Amino acid sequence: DHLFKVLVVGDAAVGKTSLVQRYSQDSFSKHYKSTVGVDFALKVLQWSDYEIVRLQLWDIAGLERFAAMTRLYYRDASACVIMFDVTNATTFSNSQRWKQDLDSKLTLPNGEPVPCLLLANKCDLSPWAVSRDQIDRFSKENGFTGWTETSVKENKNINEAMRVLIEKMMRN
């Protein structure tokens, strides 16, 4: 058995808590609220026989983006993910800012960057929904471990994307 910590970062009001409730508390859609501070969730996965893994999801509040993103949150962290809503390129620029910040202020025992995945939040919404051609530019430029479309309300691809990301994380 093992335990790991994953930090979810992104822009504000992108349903940052929606995905973490869907994956752990089995709560999807629901009312849209503002996350004042950092909140926690626990996940248990039976990845293999006699090998059960625990995950601590920390959904970092993106309201204080201008404020110094303290390394204490990323301290001892084993994984991270950037999730941005697909109705704004500002969420995309914010993800670039988060990527730069994590690349500047995150370390691993091997020294290699920890896996990162580009989550296209809420694709089940018009009009900028399946613009994967534009997303591919940053997908290959940023050197992210993965990129995958998702919809928090419908939970269309949360499970497969999370499984791929966690398999990549234990692959290191």
């Binding site: 201008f66 404020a67 704004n88 390129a89 500002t90 530019r137």
Partner: protein
């Protein structure tokens, strides 16, 4: 096969009888031009095949035969032998310029020499030798010019380095010469391309614009060429557009011609939107000329700018010019404020502009132009307020001015954008702590610049004014 070629090249070394050597050279040239094999390109590349021939041609200048066929032979050899240019350097330029100088007054002897010069100048690193000779290559080509096969249009590369005084001399004399060329060869697309880009190359000095605008000849000829010669040619339109971009100055009040060129620019950006070929030059040119002209078309400009941002995200310059054009258009025309937005039928240019800013943080120019653009947009339409705020603009630009501090223009544009963004809105204590210290530090770092101080003071004024305990901190 190769035995006969060996016999011919061996006989070429005798240099016994001019007529016999001329006939042998003609036979060798006739045999060499074939697609049978690369026997003529036998990798020897011996100068003994052609160096004695050019020596005989230069020394015995009256021998027209060696002048007529030796140039054709060397042209065929270069077109056949791949490393012939490599054999040229690492001289022949002196030989060809003496050939053009002393006795190339005949049309047939001149055309082959100019063609050989044109193909030789495509190699590179030999133009410096050509420009440092004693035969006055510029005077030679000027004396060369009513033949349809205007090989002197290869004068192009010679304008790459000419110095200012000689450039003015070329402006005068070569313009007098080239107006005849463009008038008599209006129905020659390649000739028009070469003439137009030679005009581009000579238009580099700033003082010569008055000479070029002596009787509005440059504007009229380029407009006529764009209108008639090339309805659907990309290269012609791109070159004429670059002339338009480089010919904008304090004398922009060419009102009727203004309108004309404006229309042509629109045509250009509407008929080839796939590369920097037209987009950057036309958008910058268009932005200045639209400011002057405005004192329909605006919708077309909005659409062209939107595709310009969409299709050339990787180039800093294209996005900078396009967003600058959008800013300059929106400044003089506010009626289209509702014509832009996220709604259907309106170009979502706000997210594209934001994207431009974020994807080129390393450059101050793109930030300046796009910031001014979206600031003017926010000032025009109040609905966009609190939408970009919800989209992540405030803290993002604060981090950007933290990254870019050495310039005052970037700080001034950022402060102005904050002023026009935060007007008519109320923020929280957290926003106050995230905004006020950064802008105070920016204002401290640029204390001398008056506009930065003005914009910062205006922003602080619009932004300053359980809960009491937090507010005290």
């Amino acid at each position: 096969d190769e035995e006969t070629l060996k016999k011919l090249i061996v006989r070429l070394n005798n240099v016994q009888e001019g007529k016999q050597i001329e006939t042998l050279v003609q036979i060798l040239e006739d045999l060499l031009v074939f697609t049978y094999s690369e026997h003529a390109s036998k990798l020897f590349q011996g100068k003994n095949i052609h160096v004695p021939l050019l020596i005989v041609l230069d020394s015995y200048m009256r021998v027209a035969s060696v002048q007529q066929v030796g140039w054709s032979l060397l042209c065929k050899l270069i077109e056949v032998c791949p490393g012939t240019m490599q054999s040229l350097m690492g001289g022949v330029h002196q030989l060809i310029l003496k050939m053009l100088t002393v006795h190339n007054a005949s049309v047939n002897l001149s055309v082959i020499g100019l063609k050989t010069l044109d193909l030789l100048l495509t190699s590179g690193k030999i133009t410096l030798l050509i420009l440092d000779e004693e035969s006055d290559i510029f005077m030679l080509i000027f004396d060369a010019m009513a033949n349809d096969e205007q090989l002197g249009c290869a004068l192009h590369v010679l304008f790459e380095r000419v110095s200012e005084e000689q450039l003015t001399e070329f402006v005068e004399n070569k313009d007098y010469m080239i107006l005849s060329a463009l008038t008599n060869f209006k129905d020659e697309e390649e000739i028009v391309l070469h003439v137009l880009h030679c005009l581009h190359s000579l238009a580099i000095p700033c003082n010569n614009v008055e000479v070029l605008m002596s009787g509005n000849v440059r504007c009229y000829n380029i407009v006529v060429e764009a209108m008639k010669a090339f309805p659907m040619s990309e290269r012609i339109q791109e070159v004429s557009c670059c002339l338009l971009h480089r010919l904008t100055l304090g004398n922009f009040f060419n009102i009727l011609v203004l309108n004309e060129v404006h229309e042509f620019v629109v045509k250009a950006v509407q008929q080839y939107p796939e590369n920097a070929a037209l987009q950057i030059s036309a958008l910058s040119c268009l932005a200045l000329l639209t400011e002057t002209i405005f004192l329909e078309d605006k919708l077309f400009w909005l659409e062209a700018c939107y595709k310009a941002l969409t299709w050339h995200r990787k180039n800093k310059h294209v996005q900078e010019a396009a967003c600058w054009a959008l800013n300059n258009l929106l400044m003089y025309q506010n009626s289209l404020h509702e014509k832009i937005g996220d709604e259907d039928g309106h170009f979502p240019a706000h997210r594209e502009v934001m994207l431009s800013m974020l994807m080129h943080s390393s450059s101050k120019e793109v930030f300046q132009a796009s910031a001014n653009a979206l600031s003017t947009l926010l000032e025009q339409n109040v609905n966009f307020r609190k939408i970009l705020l919800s989209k992540g603009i405030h803290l993002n630009v604060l981090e950007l001015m933290q990254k870019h501090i050495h310039s005052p223009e970037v700080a001034e544009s950022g402060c102005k954008m904050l002023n026009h963004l935060f007007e008519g809105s109320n923020t929280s204590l957290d926003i106050m702590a995230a905004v006020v210290p950064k802008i105070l530090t920016v204002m401290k770092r640029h204390e001398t610049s008056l506009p930065v101080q003005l914009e910062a003071l205006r922003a602080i004024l619009h932004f300053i004014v359980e809960f009491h305990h937090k507010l005290n901190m």
